C-alpha cells in the first residue's frame, strides 16, 4: 500500500526512568510511518482525502513535549494510538529515538519502534 | 526480483495546499524504485532490454517541475503512473520528499511513498 | 585566542523580505562565536567567570523567534549587539543561516555573518 | 511486533583471523535489533516490563571488548545468544561492523548480521 | 538467516552505454549482501566455515575495474554470478551504484540491484 | 568582518579541458563569499542596503550553465569579476567545485578558489 | 605552519555545573591542534622527532575521563597546559565539545576552545 | 588569495611506525592546497597556465602508495617538496590523514599538515 513518512521530528522532552533525567531533560527524535491508501487523494488532490502530515507533526511533538513518561515505549504507544484513531490507517510505526540517553558506552542512537495495524 | 533505484532527484517546484507555497515554491526530492527482471539485459548488454534511468530521471523531474499540485501524493501518483506504463515493470515505489515543508516543528524530512504493482 | 562556539542553534522564525514568507515562516540556524579570555574561568572553575552558553543559546533563540525582520542581517546584528553588553567579550561573530530561503536555484545554504569587536 | 534498536555502539577490540590484527586491535561498531512485544510496558510504564537498553549496551560492549575471536561471526553469535536468553524476545539481529578491516580495497564498511528467532 | 554485508566498495571503471563515458571512466560504488547460514562458523571460529569478505571485495573490485560493460546491470550480474558459485549461499543482492552518471538532472545516486537466490 | 555566504549552489555545466566532458557535461558546485559592511542594512532593514543573495545565486548559476569554459578557473573569475561591479563589496571569494572531475584516483572533491578585492 | 590535528576524540565524562550531570555523565568530544616544526621528523623519519599522536590521544582521554570539572574550560586548559610541557610545541588549541549539554533549545554543538602559545 | 584545493584523495598505503601496520597496510586520505596566481589561466583559459589537478592527484597518490614511511610527516613532506618544484607555486599545504591509525581511544581522525612556501 502507500505510506506517509515523517523523519527526524526533534523535540525537547523529559522522559526517563531516572530522576536526574527529568531535571533538565534532553533531545528526542521521532519518526512516524503511516500505511494508508493514497489513491483517492491523488484523484481529488484534496488534503481531506489524505492524512495531513502537518497535524501529525504537531500532535507527535506535543506528546513528546508533554509531561514525562518513564519509558520511551510509552511515548511511542501514545503517538501510535493517535494515528490509529483515523480509521483509514492500515498500520503505523512510531520510532522514538533517545540519542542522548545516559549510557556509559559510545553509541549513535537508541530507539524503540511501536508498531500497530488492523 | 531485480530493481533500479534512483535517489535524491532534486527539483524546484511549487506544489502545496496553501497559496503562499505557490508564490516562490521550494525544493522537492524524488526517489524512484522500479522492480523489473534484469536478467535479459545482462545477457544482451543492450540498454533496450532494461529500463533507462536517464529517461526516468528526466520524466520524473519534468513532472515535479510542472504545474503545481496541491498534494505531493498527486505528484507521486503521476510519476508512478508513468513507470507502470512500461509492461515489463512489476512494481514501483515513488517517494516524494518535501523537506522544506512549512511545519512549525523541527524535522528532517516529510514524504509520501506511492506504491504500484501488477 | 580562547573562544566559545555554539553551532547549529535551530529556531523557527518569520524573517524575510516577502509576504509569502511571513505566513508560515521557516527554519533558521544560528552559530555564535565569542572571543573571550577563559584562563580565569579555568583557574576558578566558576561559571561566573565565563560566558554561560545557556544564556547565549536561550537569548539568541528568543531573538530569532521574536518580531520578524525583513533581513537576516538585522537578526544577526541584534544577537551580536546584545552579546557585546558583556564587557569581557573581545569580539563576537553571529552567523544567521536561512537554509530554506526561497531561491529558484538548488543550493545547500545561505547565511550572513555579523562581526562586532571592541 | 515492536522493536528496540541500538545503533552505532562503538567499542575497541582485537578480533581478527590474522596475528597482526591482534597486536593493537581496531574499532568495532555494533547494531542490535530486538523484536519484543512492548504493549505491556506502555501500560505499566515500568522498565521491568521491557528489555533494558542500558544493560544491552553494556553487555554487547563487554563481549566486543573481551578476548578476541577470529571471526566477527562469532562475536555476533555471542551477543545474539545473550539477547535470546530473555524469553520475551521473539527475534534479534546483531550487526557486527568492522569498518577498519584490513582490505586492500576502498570501502565504507563490512559487517556480518547474525539473526535468531523463536 | 544470517548475512554478510559489504558496503561502499569504491572502484574506478569505464562502464557506460555512450562512447564518451569510456574515454576516462568514472567512480563506481558496489554493495554486496550475502545470505548464508553463519552458525557453523561461530561454532568453529574458522574462516573456512564462512564466506570470506576479503575475497569477496577483491573479486567484486576486479570485475568493476575490468573491461567495460555497456550496462551496470551486466556488471552486477557478473558479481552475483560469482557469489552464487558458492553452494552455501542462499541468496545475494549486488547493488552497482553509478553516482556520477551523466544525467542532466541533480540527483544523489542511481543504481541497479541484481538479486539471485536458490 | 561582515560577510554573506552562499554554499553549495549546484548547477549542471559543460566546462572541461577534454572533448569527452563536453558531450553530456557534469555537476558543478559553487560557493561565494562576499565581504561587505552590513551595519547599514541591519540599521535600515532595507534589502537595498545589502547584496541580495538571490541576485548572487541566480547570476552565478547563469554563468555556470552558460558557455563552456575549459578551466574552472575561468568560471570562477567570471563570477568574481561580476560580483565586484557592486562598489560596496570589499572582496569576494568564489569556489568552483568539480566533484565529478575525471581523475583516475579516488577523491572527494577538487576545486579552485578565485579571490578579488579592492 | 606545520601542525598535528587530532579530531573527534570521544570520551565519557562527568563534567558539568549541575548535580544532575554528575549522576550518569555524558559524551565529550575533544579536538587538539598542535603547532610544531615537522621538518626534522620528516628528515629523520624518527617518531622521537615529532609529537606522538598516541600520547596526545591517550593523555587527553585520561584527563576527560578523570576528576569531574564544573566547566569544560577547565578541562581544555588542563589538556593544553600538559601539551605545552613539550618545549618543541609553538602553540596548542584544545576544543572541548559538549554535544549533549542540557540546553532547552535545539542545537548541534557547544564547545570551548583553549589556546596556549610560547 | 587564489588556490587549488584537492580534498579526500584516498589511497591504500603501508606507512606506520609498527611492524603490525606493514603487514596489510591501511587507508590514507590526502588533502592538498596550492596557493598560486590563477588570473593568467582565467585570462588564457589554457591548462598550461595553471597547476593541473590531475598531475596533483596522480603524483600524490603514487607517493602514498609507494615505499612505506614510518611517519605520515615524511609522506606529507615528500608530496609538498615535489609540488614546490613548480616555481609558480607560492605555498603548499599537504594534510596526510590516517583515519584508521591504531590508537586505543575512539576518535574520528588524526592527521599532520605540512606547509612549504617561497
Ligand atoms: N527498552 C528501554 N530500556 C530503558 N532503559 C532505561 S534507563 N530507559 C529505558 C527505556 O525508556 N526503554
Ligand atoms: N499527507 C499530506 N499532508 C499535507 N498537508 C499539507 S499542508 N500538504 C500535505 C500533503 O501534500 N500531503
Ligand atoms: N543579503 C541578503 N539578501 C536577501 N535577499 C532576500 S529575498 N533576503 C535577503 C537577506 O535577508 N539578506
Ligand atoms: N565472513 C568473514 N570473512 C573474513 N575474512 C577475514 S580475514 N575475517 C573475516 C570474518 O571475520 N568474517
Ligand atoms: N537501467 C539502466 N539505464 C541506463 N541508461 C544508461 S545511458 N545506462 C544505463 C544503465 O547502465 N542501466
Ligand atoms: N587547475 C585545474 N587543473 C585542471 N585539470 C583539468 S583536466 N582541468 C583543470 C581545471 O579546470 N583546473
Ligand atoms: N562557557 C560555559 N558555559 C556553561 N554553562 C554551563 S551550564 N556549563 C558551561 C560551561 O562548561 N562553559
Ligand atoms: N606525529 C605522529 N605521531 C605518530 N605516532 C605514531 S604510532 N605514528 C605517528 C605519526 O606518523 N606521526
Author numbering:
A (entry chain A), B (entry chain A), C (entry chain B), D (entry chain A), E (entry chain A), F (entry chain B), ...: 2 to 119
Question: What's in the article?
Answer:
The FolB enzyme from Mycobacterium tuberculosis (MtFolB) is a potential target for anti-TB drugs due to its essential role in the survival of the bacillus and the absence of FolB homologues in humans. MtFolB exhibits three activities: aldolase, epimerase, and oxygenase. As an aldolase, this enzyme catalyses the reversible conversion of 7,8-dihydroneopterin (DHNP) to 6-hydroxymethyl-7,8-dihydropterin (HP) and glycolaldehyde (GA) in the folate biosynthesis pathway. Additionally, for MtFolB, the residues Tyr54 and Lys99 play essential roles in the epimerase and aldolase activities of FolB and it is indispensable for the survival of the bacillus.
